[PDB]
């Protein structure tokens, strides 16, 4: 009854049109494989966009926003069809409706639209969504509405190329600072993932995040009770420490390395490998930061992972050790060899990964000095010539 639904929706009997719209909403909001493409072919999009403008019928507006939300949850082509119907400006206008349902459903639909891609994101931004979106941030807001708002913020921050506008980043960061102090685990996870995406953009974005003054709230969450929060915060601080040594030191000043023994001993190898990646980026910094890592007593755990851990964690630990050997003083390399690192650092030489093999060979060669691929054989020969001969 799709075309009968469409025709009845194109009616001026409020009852008939609302019944048809809620029937289409039912069709599109149940079966795992909905009839989005067929209902688009039947021409329901312009009718629903028209219904969005009917301020005199709030429930019709709400049901139309619902149907369009679920239509935009399908393929990129279907989301782009919704966008082509001229639904985004009407959603933007309904954000300021006196009824909260149309407003929340418009936030939902605009989030689905923004999440499609960076071009739709930039269009919705140009139309000015950020200010009314963050105006809803208030203590009296229901946690459901606030969760949807935070999800929309994550979607706004998600895409990398092109990155979100600097002014939108500047507007969003203060709201993230307000929300980082929320109890709701979903809100906190969304906030941390959003600022993680922001810190994955570039060094100037990392510097803006550092200027906001939220890193000292981010670091404690490394030991949060929730593994989702922990993983998001781990990736965020990892991104931040991929930048300059100044920013890395700002991260380290919040007593971050205190949270890493539990992460290194965690039962989840993904947590293990991300923690080892963070520590590798730390070992690729100043000798003072290498000394800090050594003082936190994380090096023996890094070596144990290099010895008996998952192969990805082993690769990351090889990276960390090699970065320490090239960027460490003779006393620190001496400590490394005292902690029995040579056997496990050598056993990896047999793996296929040319990158990790070359990293191991370089670490070994630099250690000795401190005491297929051309790059590999050349190092093998240079090391053998200087130390074997």
């Amino acid at each position: 009854s799709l075309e009968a639904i469409v025709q009845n929706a194109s009616s001026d009997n409020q009852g008939i049109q609302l019944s048809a719209v809620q029937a289409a909403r039912k069709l599109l909001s149940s079966d795992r494989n909905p009839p989005i493409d067929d209902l688009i072919k039947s021409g329901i999009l312009p009718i629903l966009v028209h219904c969005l403008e009917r301020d005199d019928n709030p429930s019709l507006q709400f049901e139309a926003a619902w149907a369009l939300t679920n239509i935009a949850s399908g393929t990129s082509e279907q989301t782009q069809a919704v966008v082509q119907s001229n639904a985004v400006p009407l959603f933007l206008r309904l954000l300021h409706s006196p009824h909260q349902n149309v407003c929340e459903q418009a936030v939902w639909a605009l989030g689905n639209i923004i999440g499609d891609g960076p071009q739709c994101r930039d269009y919705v931004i140009s139309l000015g969504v950020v200010k009314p979106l963050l105006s809803f941030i208030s203590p009296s807001i229901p946690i459901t509405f606030l969760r949807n708002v935070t999800w929309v913020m994550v979607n706004l921050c998600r895409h990398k190329d092109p990155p979100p506008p600097m002014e939108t980043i500047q507007e969003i960061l203060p709201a993230l600072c307000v929300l980082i102090h929320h109890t709701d685990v979903n809100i906190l996870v969304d906030t941390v993932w959003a600022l993680s995406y922001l810190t994955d953009a570039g060094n100037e974005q990392i510097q803006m995040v550092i200027d906001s003054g939220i890193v000292p709230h981010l670091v404690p969450l490394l030991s949060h009770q929730e593994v989702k929060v922990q993983t998001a915060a781990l990736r965020a601080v990892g991104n931040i420490v991929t930048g300059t040594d100044e920013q890395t030191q700002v991260v380290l000043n919040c007593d971050a390395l205190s949270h890493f023994p539990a992460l290194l001993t965690h039962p989840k190898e993904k947590i293990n490998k991300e923690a080892v990646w963070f520590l590798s980026n730390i070992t690729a910094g100043n000798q003072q930061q290498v000394q800090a890592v050594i003082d936190a007593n994380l090096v023996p755990m890094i070596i144990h992972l290099l010895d008996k851990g998952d192969f990805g964690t082993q690769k990351e630990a090889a990276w960390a050790i090699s970065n320490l050997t090239i960027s460490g003083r003779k006393d620190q390399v001496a400590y490394l060899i005292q902690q029995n690192v040579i056997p496990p650092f050598c056993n990896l030489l047999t793996v296929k990964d040319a990158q990790v093999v070359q990293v191991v060979l370089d670490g070994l060669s630099n250690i000795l000095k401190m005491a297929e691929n051309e790059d590999i054989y050349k190092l093998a020969y240079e090391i053998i010539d200087q130390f074997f001969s």
Binding site: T69, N70, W108, N281, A284
Partner: peptide, 15 residues
């Protein structure tokens, strides 16, 4: 030197 994370549509339906 410093290394970055390896490269890895979030839409939600209302039921």
């Amino acid at each position: 030197r410093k290394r970055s994370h390896s490269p890895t549509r979030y839409v939600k339906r209302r039921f």
